Structure formats: C-alpha cells, structure tokens
C-alpha cells in the first residue's frame, strides 16, 4: 500500500521501549483521536438583544443552529477573541481529516441572562443551507415557534443554567458528510424562550459547547487540508 510503504529501510538503532501510550508514566493511555474528540469544546457563542428578535416574541426561537461535527464556519471578529487567536478547536481539526461520520453529538447549551424556562428542539431533517447560525427575527416562518412532536427539552434557568442534551443521528443515508461545502448533516437545533419573560436591556448570552456521542465514528481517512499556525496571531 503506497501510503505506508517503506522501501529500503536503513535503521541505525533498535526501536524505543514502549510506555503503553503513556500508561506507564501517566495513568492513562492516549492511543486514539476519538477519545480526544469527546472532551467538550466551544461551538457557537453569541449575544441576542431585544429588537433583533420577533415582533410578538413569546415562545419563539432565539437561534437555529446547524449541527455539524466539523465546526460552524468561524469569523474572527474583535468581540470574542477566542475564534481569533485560538482558531478552531481540536474537534474541527480532527474532523477535517476524515470524510464521513455516523453518530450523534452531545451539546451543552448555557443560556443566561433571562433566567426563565428555556427550550431546545432537534429537527433531524431540515438541512443544510448555511454555515452560520440564524438569530431571532431572521429565522424562517415555520422555524419560529416550537413544533409539535419533535424531540425537545425544557429547563428553568432558575433551577439550573446548563442544558446538556444528546442529539441522535437520524438520516436516510449511510453517512453524514464531514467537511461539507454549502440531507447531509445532523439537521437543525432550535433554542428558544417559552413565553416572553422581559429581556434584559443588554443581551441574552448563549453559548453552545459540543462533543461526540458514544456511537459516533469518523469514517474514511483522506488527507488533512492546509493548516495555519496559531502562534502567528
């Protein structure tokens, strides 16, 4: 096989004795990228103001966020300097090397400001038109309010501030496509308020973090794209 082929090997010394992937000196074995990809990382972080929401703005969406196992497309503005100096996370970088996937994501949505009953809902097949989220008044007529019978979840920001949910993989096809260009992905995730708590005069600060589920798998290893060093920022 041409990728791993090694002709005429000239090796001066023996090979180095093994630590069982670090289990000898540390306690754990770092043998796999799928375990590194299950440590949570930031996904999208935004603010939402009154007045760029709906007119009536009782139980409505605040964000429809597209679920991609690679990241959303990043733009490194001056508001969140994360996306600027840290570039992408470890998950978009691991993901850019594989072609397909099959499996779900885990999310952690931390929506505060607001401190009322907030809700989340997964539309497994309404994909996949764009690489940004859509805020408030710009989400389309039929993604505006909650729907009936889509898998959803509800939480009082008074009891607890963090919603942690796991999105299933519901698709007709064999794979979902990593590195899509722009029914390929995991569909949409809608986040929204449950009935018109008055909004603080600055912001509802939402931030989504994500990871890989347990049954998730990266599937066909082609190359990595060209990278950019973070220390050059």
């Amino acid at each position: 096989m041409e990728r791993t082929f090694t002709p005429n090997v000239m090796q001066p010394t023996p090979l180095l004795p093994t630590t069982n992937d670090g289990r000898v000196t540390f306690g754990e074995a770092f043998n796999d990228l799928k375990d590194l990809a299950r440590r949570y990382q930031l996904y999208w972080e935004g603010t939402i103001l009154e007045g760029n929401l709906r007119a009536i703005r009782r139980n409505s969406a605040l964000v429809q966020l597209p679920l991609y196992p690679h990241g959303l497309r990043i733009q490194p503005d001056v508001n969140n300097p994360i996306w600027n100096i840290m570039r992408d996370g470890h998950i978009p970088v691991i993901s850019s090397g594989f072609r397909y996937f099959r499996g779900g994501l885990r999310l952690r949505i931390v929506v505060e400001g607001l401190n009322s009953c907030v809700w989340v809902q997964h539309h497994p097949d309404r994909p996949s038109i764009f690489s940004r989220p859509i805020i408030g008044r710009y989400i389309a007529a039929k993604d505006a309010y909650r729907n009936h019978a889509y898998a959803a979840y509800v939480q009082n920001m008074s009891v607890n501030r963090t919603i942690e949910v796991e999105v299933p993989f519901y698709q007709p096809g064999l794979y979902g496509m990593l590195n899509a260009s722009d029914f390929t992905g995991l569909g949409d995730l809608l986040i929204g308020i449950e009935g018109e708590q008055p909004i603080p005069k600055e912001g509802i600060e939402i931030s989504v973090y994500y990871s890989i589920a347990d049954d998730f798998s990266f599937n066909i290893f082609c190359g990595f794209p060209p990278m950019v060093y973070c220390d050059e920022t």
């Binding site: 791993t4 090694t6 002709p7 005429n8 090997v9 001066p12 010394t13 090979l15 180095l16 093994t18 670090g22 770092f30 043998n31 796999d32 990228l33 799928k34 375990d35 590194l36 299950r38 440590r39 949570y40 497309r73 990043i74 490194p76 001056v78 600027n84 570039r87 992408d88 470890h90 978009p92 594989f98 099959r102 952690r108 809902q121 898998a151 979840y153 607890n160 963090t162 942690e164 949910v165 796991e166 299933p168 064999l174 589920a213 049954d215 798998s217 990266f218 066909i220 290893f221 190359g223 990595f224 794209p225 060209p226 990278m227 950019v228 060093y229 973070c230 220390d231 050059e232 920022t233």
Partner: protein
Amino acid sequence: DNPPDPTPAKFFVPIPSHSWAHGTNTSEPTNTLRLDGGVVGVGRSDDIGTSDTAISGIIGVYGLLKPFDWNANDTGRNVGGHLLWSMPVHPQVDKDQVIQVMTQSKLTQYYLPPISVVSSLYAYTRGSIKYKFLFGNNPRHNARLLVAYIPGISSDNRLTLERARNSAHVVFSLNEVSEFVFTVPYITDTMWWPRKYFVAPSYICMFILNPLVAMESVPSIVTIVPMIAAGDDFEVAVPAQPAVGLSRNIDVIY
C-alpha cells in the same frame, strides 16, 4: 398502611453539570432526544466500517516536505562534503521546510504531514520518525549520500561532514534505487519531549559523499522529495491547545 420512613437525610453537593474534561472510561448522564429511552446507538454494518481514528494508523501515512535539487553540472555545490539538506528532528516539521501558500494580509497556509497535525494536538511526544527520501532519477545517475542524526544540536553552525560521521548515520548509494527510509533514533535525556510550536531534541543532515554523475543523454537535475511518517514506537502524550487551526477562514485581526 402508610408507615413512616424516618431514615436520616443524606448530604449531597449540588453542581451544575458533569465532567467537562472526561472523554473515556466512564458514563455520562445526559438528556437524550430520542423517542426511545435507554442506551441506544445508530445501527452499523460492513457498509460502514468501524471508526478509523486509532492514532498509530493516522500517523503511519507519509506527508510531503519541500523538494530540492542537485544540479550535477554545478561544479560548486556538487563536491565531497557539501551538505544538501538538514533540519531539526521533531514531529512538527520546521516551518521553513513545509510547502507554504502565502497571502497578503492573511495567514500563511502550511501543508503539514499527518504526523505533524496529530503532534499539534498533544503536549508531549516521543519515539522514532521515518524519513523516506524519494529521488527523481533513472538507471544512469549515481551518487552516495551520508545521512547522519546528531543528538542534541539545534542548527548547522558547527556541522560539517567530517563531524557528522561521528554520530548514527546511514550511507546510501542511489544507483538504480529511488527511495529509502531512514528511521532516525530517539535519543533524549527525557522520556517525553514537549511540543515545539522551543528547541528540537536532535538534528538531521545529508552530505554528498560521492558527487552526482550523469551524461549528455540524461537530465542533469535530480529532484529529491523528503517525506515523513511516524515510526512503530511513536507515541503522543497530553491533549493541549492545538498549535494549528483550519484554513477554512484565514482572516486575522492583529
């Protein structure tokens, strides 16, 4: 009956969520969005392999480094001892021997071999590296090269052929041979060596031993393509801030 249950009330310490760090060897309480409730996963078959992410298989693949020329008709640089190529030995290849695509006001895009992307995801790393050199030539060229591995050197300042022959090295003769792999040792006072993007633990270099020959019927330039993959014992250590981002969006705010 409604008997009373007087059993003492236990303590318990409230926290907003589960572990943000843990990735393995545990369960994760979570609210799944399924019609079903239970430990459930998406179906598979042979149509869909298992996950391919086991590190040793990803890092076994060669990535390519900047190629470079002998000019056999060059009377100056084609001599006994002239050193062709060299670089510090570590998994992240040095920024100047990678193929780059530079843009005005944007970030520079590097093509990193698969070992160099994986090694950017971890904090320490150790084990041997393979350098497969690939010569564009035909049966009529001939030369010999001495490729030495100098432990504990940063740059070529004090490096000559007469010194390089005092370390581990391999003498290769390109006489109808187009590829050879040089598995460099790993010699370091410590067990894990930290990432670079620091100094590299060692250095590698390649000297002309017998200069290149060729004729009037054959091209005088021989291009060499260096390629790098991890050895059999190579291992990575502690997940860290990736040294590299993706190039999907290369805009940067200074």
